[PDB]
Amino acid sequence: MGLFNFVKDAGEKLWDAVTGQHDKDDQAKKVQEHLNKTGIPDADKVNIQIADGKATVTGDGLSQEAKEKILVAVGNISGIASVDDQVKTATPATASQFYTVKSGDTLSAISKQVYGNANLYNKIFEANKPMLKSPDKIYPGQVLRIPEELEHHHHHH
Ligand SMILES: [K+]
């Protein structure tokens, strides 16, 4: 209900994660820019803070999908180990799970893990977008956003 845990070393290499580059809001700056570069929706609706590697998102008035959306992009920074969600939602949306890619897994393999079916790799990857590069282009530490598999009966191919 507050903090989310991520990988640290894994994610977009925005800065020199070896030390933290320069300063707190500068680290955040990269993150904000990163979300704008990637094209993360509602990334302007929120706000990002950085505490060495503990990022904090805030904002209000978006959907929960938008909120977590930012979390993923912010929590997938090389240098960021976690994201403190402080952003508020104005409209009802479906909540998702967060799965961290392990060394050897593919979008399919993890989809099969989270959904029970690998064919749902797209639902994840496209949801991890535009943060995620490509399905088989994941990387160890990629905490992919796992949308809620509504009605397990049918749907899944
Ligand atoms: K990270």
UniProtKB/Swiss-Prot annotation:
GO MF annotation list: potassium ion binding
Domain named BON: residues: 23-91
Compartment(s) where it occurs, according to its Swiss-Prot or TrEMBL record: Cytoplasm
Domain (LysM) ranges: 97-146
Keywords of this entry: Cytoplasm, Potassium
GO cellular component, one term: cytoplasm
Disulfide bonds listed in the record: none
Disrupted gene: phenotype observed: Deletion mutant shows retarded growth at high concentrations of K(+). Deletion of the gene impacts the abundance of muropeptide species. The absence of YgaU leads to the activation of the Cpx pathway.
Gene3D superfamilies: LysM domain (3.10.350.10)
Coiled coil (UniProt feature): none
Induction of the gene: Transcriptionally regulated by CpxR, which binds directly to the promoter region.
Family matches, as InterPro entries: Bact_Kbp (IPR052196), BON_dom (IPR007055), LysM_dom (IPR018392), LysM_dom_sf (IPR036779), Transpt-assoc_nodulatn_dom_bac (IPR014004)
UniProt-listed GO biological process terms: response to potassium ion
SUPFAM superfamilies listed in its UniProt record: LysM domain (SSF54106)
Family annotation (NCBIfam families): PRK11198.1
This protein's domain notes: BON and LysM domains are both required for full K(+) binding. The major K(+) binding site is located in the BON domain and this initial complex is stabilized by interaction with the LysM domain.
Described function: Highly specific potassium binding protein that is required for normal growth in the presence of high levels of external K(+). May act as a sensor of cytoplasmic K(+) concentration. Binds a single K(+) ion, which induces a large conformational change. Can also bind the larger alkali metal ions Rb(+) and Cs(+), and NH(4)(+). May be involved in the regulation of peptidoglycan cross-linking.
Protein name: Potassium binding protein Kbp
Gene: kbp
